[PDB]
Every structure is written in C-alpha cells, then in structure tokens.
C-alpha cells in the first residue's frame, strides 16, 4: 500500500527537504503540530529512527519492504549501508525519477504503476521492480503522446542525471550500466545510523 498523505509534512518533521523545490518547507521549517515549537530532549533512538524515516519517506518503501531490503543488504558481502542505498536505488521508480521523466518520486511511482513503461519488451507495471545491469527501459506508444508525459519530456531541463543512467533518444529511452556506488547514490542523510537501528 502507498502513502497518500501530505508530503511536505514529513519533510517538516524530519528536518530535511525531500522533494527539494517546495516553498512550504522554507516558510515553515519547524515540525508540525501545536507543539512543534517545543524544545525536545535528545535521544540516540530518536536520531536513528528519524534517519530511517527520511530514507523510507524519500523513497516510498514501507517498513516490511525496507526491513527485507536491509536483511538482503546485510547478507550481501559489501558494507551494509552501501548495499542498502544501492538496492533502494535499483528500484524502477527511483531509476525513472533519476533519468528525468518524472518531476518527482510520486510521479515515477504512479507512472510506473499504471504501466507507462516497459523493460526489455515486457509490460512491467510494478514500482518495486529492481533494475539490474544492462537493462533497456522504453515507453509504450499510447503513453508516448500523452500530454503530461510529453510536457515533462519536452521541458526536461531540471536536475542532471547521474553517470550510470543515460537517456539517449528523443523517444525518452533509458539505459543503465552498473549499480551505483556510494559516491553515485548522492542522496542526503547517512547510512551508519540506519544500520545501527536495525542492529539494535
């Protein structure tokens, strides 16, 4: 199940802007509620918890899914934080957002869910699909001409794409080399606290 509630709310609480370009965070940087102005006693559990909240509420994953991802990454031979971030960046929704066809992660989630994409010729309408090496992501014809997709693709002068993603043609084709490393994820926040929380 997805989360539908307001988005700037969670950025407000967590102290970090997630979408990035909203005005509500700047005009209200403090946490919500009647007592969002109250001074708050510090706690290592609070730190580690809020870190996970930023990660999960930036990517869209739920707690069960994220815990499974963490267990997978801990099982992986690499450093647990790096394996975490590269696994959560292998998601189709994140890849689509990163390639520029989605103005936001919610855009990418819905646009993948309604089956506007196709990887290696198969109609993949699931956001949690994990992109592997050497995958070619194309769009279908019915979605190629639709007004919002067209607007986003034609006006796409926003944030630069990373190295391993590459858009190459005017048809909005996506091609991937490799799974990112800790330099190339370059999402905010920190991984050690994420690992320690689940190590508790």
């Amino acid at each position: 199940a997805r989360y539908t509630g307001p988005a700037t709310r969670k950025s407000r609480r967590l102290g970090v802007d997630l979408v990035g370009g909203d005005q509500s965070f700047e005009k209200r940087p403090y946490p919500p509620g009647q007592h969002g102005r109250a001074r708050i006693k510090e706690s290592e559990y609070r730190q580690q918890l809020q870190e996970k909240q930023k990660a999960r509420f930036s990517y869209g994953v739920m707690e069960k899914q994220f815990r499974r991802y963490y267990e997978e990454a801990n099982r992986q031979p690499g450093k647990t934080g790096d394996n975490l971030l590269r696994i959560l960046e292998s998601r189709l929704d994140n890849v689509v957002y990163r390639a520029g066809l989605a103005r936001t992660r919610r855009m990418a989630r819905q646009l993948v869910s309604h089956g506007h994409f196709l990887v290696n010729g198969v109609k993949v309408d699931i956001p949690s699909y994990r992109v592997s090496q050497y995958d070619i992501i194309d769009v279908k014809e019915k979605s190629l001409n639709t007004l919002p997709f067209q607007i986003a693709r034609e006006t796409a002068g926003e944030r630069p794409i990373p190295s391993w993603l590459q858009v190459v043609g005017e048809r909005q084709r996506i091609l991937v080399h490799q799974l990112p490393e800790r330099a190339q994820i370059d999402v905010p926040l920190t991984e050690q606290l994420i690992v320690e929380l689940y190590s508790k």
């Binding site: 647990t80 690992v195 190590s199």
Partner: protein, 180 residues
C-alpha cells in the same frame, strides 16, 4: 572540534540538621573522534556547572586509542570496580554495537565498527571505567614487535597488514584532496 557526550546526570543528596542538601553529578566524555578520548567526572550544585567541571576534567585527562583505520587492533577484556566490558574488533561497515556508556566513550574516541558487551555492574560510571581500562589494555603492532624484538612481518597477520595498507592509502588520499 571536540565531541562531548553526557551519559549520566545523577541527583545526589547529603542530609544535615536542617534537612537534605542536594547537588548534581555529571559523567562527561570528551573526544575528538580521531583516536583521542578522555573521561571526566564533575559535581556541582547545578547541572550546567557540573557539566562544565566534567568537561574540564575530561579535557585535563586525555588518552590515546590504538585504532587500525576504523576498528581497534585486537579483542580485549577490561575490568574496573565491579564492571566488566569486552571489546572485539569488527569488520568495516558494521557500526558501533554497544550499550549507552560504552557507545558514548567508544564513539567519542572515534571508533566506528566494533562489538562491545558489558558483563556486570550496569552502573554507568563503572561501565565507563571498564571501557577505559579495556582501551588502555590495547597494544599497537609496531610496539609489540619492538617489545619482542621482531620485524612486523612475524608479529602481525596478513589481514592486519592489508588493513594497515588500506588505512594508510585512505589517509594519504584524503590529505591530497585537502591540500590541493
């Protein structure tokens, strides 16, 4: 950049003819995160004053930890008062795994990945002293080699040698990035 943590604020009392006189105690750990740590215990009539005394005491009593890049050299077992703490080196990317007081001392000293467990006397101050004793018990490979008069090849294992190489490489790369 000194990193300070305050693990225990305890309200302590002495009784006189009129009644109870109350004072506060603070156990403060001061560290830079680069391998230099020191524990301070201060007491005063108010929390901020006790905190200042603890910080000054900790800065007065400093102490160096024999890290290997990120983790400590070898497993050890510290004992102070009735507190017992075991420390075990961890692999890169593990993170600090320890209780409250032990985690505070351990992360102020600059250790990132280490396994730690307290085996008695859950009192915070005694666990801190046990951790300090365990850290004092650590030895560097160069010093062990000098102590028994052998070259580093016959003292430390190959795994520690490669870890030393990689830690030196990271230090040099960061120094090059900073200088230019």
């Amino acid at each position: 950049n000194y990193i300070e943590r305050v693990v225990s604020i305890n309200r302590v009392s002495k009784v006189v003819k009129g009644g109870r006189r109350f004072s506060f105690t603070a156990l403060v750990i001061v560290g830079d995160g680069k391998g230099m740590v020191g524990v301070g215990y201060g007491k005063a009539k108010e929390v901020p004053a006790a905190i200042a005394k603890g910080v000054e005491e900790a800065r007065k009593n400093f102490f160096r930890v024999p890290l290997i890049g990120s983790t400590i050299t070898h497993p050890v077992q510290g004992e102070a008062a009735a507190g017992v703490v075991m420390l075990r080196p961890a692999s890169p990317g593990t993170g600090v795994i320890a209780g409250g007081a032990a985690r505070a001392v351990l992360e102020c000293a600059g250790v990132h990945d280490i396994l730690a467990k307290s085996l008695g006397s859950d009192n915070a101050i005694n666990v801190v002293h046990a951790t300090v004793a365990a850290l004092k018990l650590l030895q560097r490979p160069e010093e062990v080699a000098a102590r028994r008069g052998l070259p580093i090849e016959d003292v430390a294992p190959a795994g520690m040698l490669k870890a030393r190489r990689e830690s030196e490489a990271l230090a040099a790369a960061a120094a090059r990035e900073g200088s230019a």
